[PDB]
Design brief:
This is part of a larger assembly, with chains A (about 120 residues) and B (about 220 residues).
Chain A: H1 15-18, H2 21-28, E1 45-47, H3 54-57, E2 67-69, E3 82-83, H4 91-107
Parallel strand pairs in A: 1-2, 2-3
Chain B: H1 30-38, H2 40-44, E1 60-64, E2 75-78, H3 93-96, H4 98-102, E3 114-116, H5 124-130, H6 141-145, H7 147-153, E4 159-163, E5 178-182, E6 197-199, E7 208-214
Parallel strand pairs in B: 2-3
Antiparallel strand pairs in B: 1-2, 4-5, 4-7, 6-7
The chains are: A mainly alpha (about 120), B alpha+beta (about 220).
Chain B binds one RNA strand of 829 nucleotides through strand 5.
Subcellular location (chain A): Plastid, Chloroplast
Protein name (chain A): Small ribosomal subunit protein uS2c
Organism (chain A): Spinacia oleracea (Spinach)
RNA sequence: GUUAUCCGGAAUGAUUGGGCGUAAAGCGUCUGUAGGUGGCUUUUUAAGUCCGCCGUCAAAUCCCAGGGCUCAACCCUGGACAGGCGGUGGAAACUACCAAGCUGGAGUACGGUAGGGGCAGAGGGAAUUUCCGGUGGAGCGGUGAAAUGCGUAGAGAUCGGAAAGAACACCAACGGCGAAAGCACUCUGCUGGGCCGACACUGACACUGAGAGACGAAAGCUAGGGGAGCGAAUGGGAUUAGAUACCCCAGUAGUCCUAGCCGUAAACGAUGGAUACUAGGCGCUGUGCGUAUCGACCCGUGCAGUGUUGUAGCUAACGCGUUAAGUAUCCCGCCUGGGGAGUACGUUCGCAAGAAUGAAACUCAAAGGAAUUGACGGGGGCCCGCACAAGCGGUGGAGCAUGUGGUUUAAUUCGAUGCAAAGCGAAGAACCUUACCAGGGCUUGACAUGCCGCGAAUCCUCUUGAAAGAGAGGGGUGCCUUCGGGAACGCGGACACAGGUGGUGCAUGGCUGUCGUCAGCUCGUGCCGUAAGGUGUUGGGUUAAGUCCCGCAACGAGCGCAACCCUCGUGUUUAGUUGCCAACGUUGAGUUUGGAACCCUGAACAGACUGCCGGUGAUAAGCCGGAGGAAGGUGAGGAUGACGUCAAGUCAUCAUGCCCCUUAUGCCCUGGGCGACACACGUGCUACAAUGGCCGGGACAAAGGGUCGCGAUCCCGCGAGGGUGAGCUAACCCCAAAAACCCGUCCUCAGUUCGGAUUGCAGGCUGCAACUCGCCUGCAUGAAGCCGGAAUCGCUAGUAAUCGCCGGUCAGCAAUACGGCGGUGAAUU
């Protein structure tokens, strides 16, 4: 829908299809603006509050994917393999644990720059 | 029973043309239908004796009759032209005189040409004589219906649907069987779906097959 | 092989092996004897128990190893086993006995707290009923409506006073107390249980518990009292098809008190009591503590008590969840299919009604529990169609047409009959059609193929007869062959068959109605639950619509919806006859030359897509208005109507299974029948007028038809129509001159210058032929009927209503059936 939006097919398509194709794009750029960049199936799944998104962790344990999470106080650590006991609401608590986890992935690759 | 509209009757105005396209004055119009139906009953069955021989084995696809004055086109579309034409030039010779003895009055010089189809699993008329031919030899029904679905999908089609009526495998109560794969838009006119209807013999009753083959959009 | 019989399968009596919240199952609740079980320490006994040994456990079976009949069965050696009992010599942890203790069990005392715990005796307030008196008026009481009843010898209502009985508002609370049942206005007297707290003391003195003893909601019973209200019974009124019910007016036992008796209840948390353990989040009562408690309060620590998206676990599921049906221990009660039964018999108890204990025969193969899908509901929440409502016209009344039952008849042929039967299949039945009846006839025979004979085949045939048919008459005999013979056709003969609108569409194909055009019906992947399944197709809004937006383990897709196709409404481009014709010459009639501009005509193209503006609305969808436009919010209206419901309709369309008939329910012909009737019902038409009728003049349509046809002009007849006959095979000819409407006149509401039914007499036309059975014309006659009960139908625009025309069917049954066209033109939401 991105390649036909900037082509010579815009003048040929009728007004009945031109109103539906831009409505389909409006729903596909708002929600699917995050999930795009990569394609493969992950081996490890990192998540913030897994009690709010229990639908995300319960679907990973049935396939055999190792679970890691940033568990708070309102959560249970039995279905999780390696847990990180810390706050999930305050913006400062979410920023430290997640950027230092990214620094661990960037250290086992190349270039150690700033935050 | 409570089925959808005939896709050969709904698509009569556009795309799919008539099996007979001609013109006549309302004085000799009634004799025009009688001469075109008598030969369509003699080419589809095509047997002088009381046997189950020719025409039904090769599979007839379409019979197009075009006439102006004293000459009919009668072009038959066959799957296998080995049975109708020759085994040594005698087969088409007895067919040339059979249509001549029935239609006379004026000098009716009838020319019959033959053309082939790309694949017999694309047209609805061979499927109505193939699957209904498996009911005559008493083979497993639901296995023959699922094989008629896949044999058309491998022949490059976008959708296919098959269904009969009652009296299956010798049962007292009448039931219905339905298997479908892909998409078959039954309502729209821009679908060019072709139809056919054939009857079975059977010593226990009588069956009736309906073919729905969806080509392009 | 069958039958009989025991065991197994039956962890369906389970000691190894089961259960009791709802499936069968805790006795209604306590106290408690026997019985079962019983904390901690040491010593001792050592009985149980355990070790070893000595007897006996007959032999033979069984089992292990090994032999003999040729194998085996069988026979046989030794061993094993005989799981037991007794005795002796030990071991001593546990259980038990004995002795001395300890303490967390349990109990008691001290000091406080809460409570409808119970019994007895008083006393308090409201109200109801009744008695008496005052005031005052004719109504009151009651119901979905009414009536019975109470009332002018005057109730009710109202005020004052009295008498009496019962229960006792509010506080009351998801509250509290009690073993259960059960118990609440206040007070006094006697009395029980529970809980907390510093402790002091005993010391396991414990737990459970068949029998047994005691307590028992209400109803009921005995004797003596009381009795306001309520109210079994009973008596009236009403409702209803009936109601010896519900409802209304009265009303006895009873309900209340004392004493005794009966002992039952979904006596239900339907989950017996006692003890120890096992994640958590909110609500009572005691007590300790919290800058001196500065405060409504804050932090603990116990008792009893709810709900919880309640977790683990348990459970068939629902659900329970430390007041669990969770994990365990102690003991008691109970079940082991449904009906019969919890009845019969017997015993016991009772004043009685009955209670308690508790069968069998026979009979079925099922009862039962939870949960799931769907449907249904005089269940609920929210939404859509003339569905109602708002409104117009109509039906049922009337005369006539037509269809169906019933009746009748020789037949009045068949099928369809709640809606999805009832001018319905037959869009056309005088013969035919027709299939039915009667009568006269033929049978491989009316129709198909094959064999044989005479033969071509035919035309005109004559006689008898209702005809079907039968007997004979001439006239006549083509085309090919080694003429032997054949095709086309005919009569006759033999045999397979031919033939069936005969039965069964609850044996079927094909096709249809119907809910429905309602809008839903499903799938892939992924999750949820043990699972059947569910989720997506739910929810919040929104549209004709799972249409769309948002929310949401749902994410996407398929059929359906929509759109694509056909006409209608605007314009534009192209092409102009049998079309049209502005400008220009006219026999005024486009009529002629001529012109293509316009109308029309026929193919294409453009255009509405809420798209744009604003408001509402959740800065969505969508809706409400507006702008621009011929046309907008699926433009109007068709076609198109899913998975499926009714084994709904059709084997009389056809086809087909089976069955049946086959000198026959097969076939031919003549006449009759289907349009017979005392009646009933449905669907229509014509009128009851004067917004109408009639006479005369007179303005505009669309859409279709037509060569065994449509048929003008002219002549003739009052007319239907007939004679002659042109043209059109057709936007060039004809079928029509369309009717309402409109101007003038007449009438002027009397069953009529409304209405035409019916009837007589005389004709026309189509066909052998029309009495039964026809259409139409002419003349005369001219009723019913004055808009019609209960009930009920369609339609929201160019629709209702109404006024004409055409077509299909067809020789003929032409505006009354069906289909199709246009004219005029609303009401209400």
């Amino acid at each position: 829908l991105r390649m036909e939006q900037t082509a010579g097919r815009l003048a040929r398509l009728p007004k009945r299809d031109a109103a539906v194709v831009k409505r389909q794009l409006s729903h596909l750029q708002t929600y699917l603006g995050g999930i795009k960049y990569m394609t493969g199936l992950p081996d490890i799944v990192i998540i913030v509050d897994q009690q709010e998104e229990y639908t995300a962790l319960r679907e990973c344990i049935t396939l055999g994917i190792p679970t890691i999470c940033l568990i708070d106080t309102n959560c249970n650590p039995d279905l999780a393999d390696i847990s990180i006991p810390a706050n999930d609401d305050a913006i400062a608590s979410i920023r430290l644990i997640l950027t230092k986890l990214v620094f661990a992935i960037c250290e086992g690759r190349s270039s150690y720059i700033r935050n | 029973m409570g089925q959808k509209i005939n896709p050969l009757g709904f698509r009569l105005g556009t795309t799919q043309s008539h099996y007979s396209l001609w013109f006549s004055q309302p004085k000799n119009y009634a004799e025009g239908l009688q001469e075109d139906q008598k030969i369509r009953d003699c080419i589809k069955n095509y047997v002088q004796k009381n046997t189950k021989t020719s025409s039904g084995v090769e599979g007839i696809a379409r019979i197009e009759i075009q006439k102006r004055i004293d000459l009919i086109q009668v072009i038959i579309h066959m799957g296998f032209p080995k049975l109708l034409i020759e085994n040594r030039p005698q087969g088409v010779e007895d067919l040339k005189i059979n249509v001549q003895k029935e239609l006379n009055c004026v000098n009716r010089k009838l020319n019959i040409a033959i053309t082939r189809i790309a694949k017999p699993y694309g047209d609805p008329n061979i499927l109505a004589e193939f699957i209904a031919g498996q009911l005559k030899s008493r083979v497993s029904f639901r296995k023959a219906m699922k094989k008629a679905i896949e044999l058309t999908e491998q022949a490059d089609t976008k959708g296919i649907q098959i269904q009969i009526a009652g009296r299956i495998d010798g049962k007292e109560i009448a039931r219905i069987e339905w298997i479908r794969e892909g998409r078959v838009p039954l309502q729209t006119i821009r679908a060019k779906i072709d139809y056919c209807a054939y009857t079975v013999r059977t010593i226990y009753g009588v069956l009736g097959i309906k073919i729905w083959i969806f080509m392009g959009e």
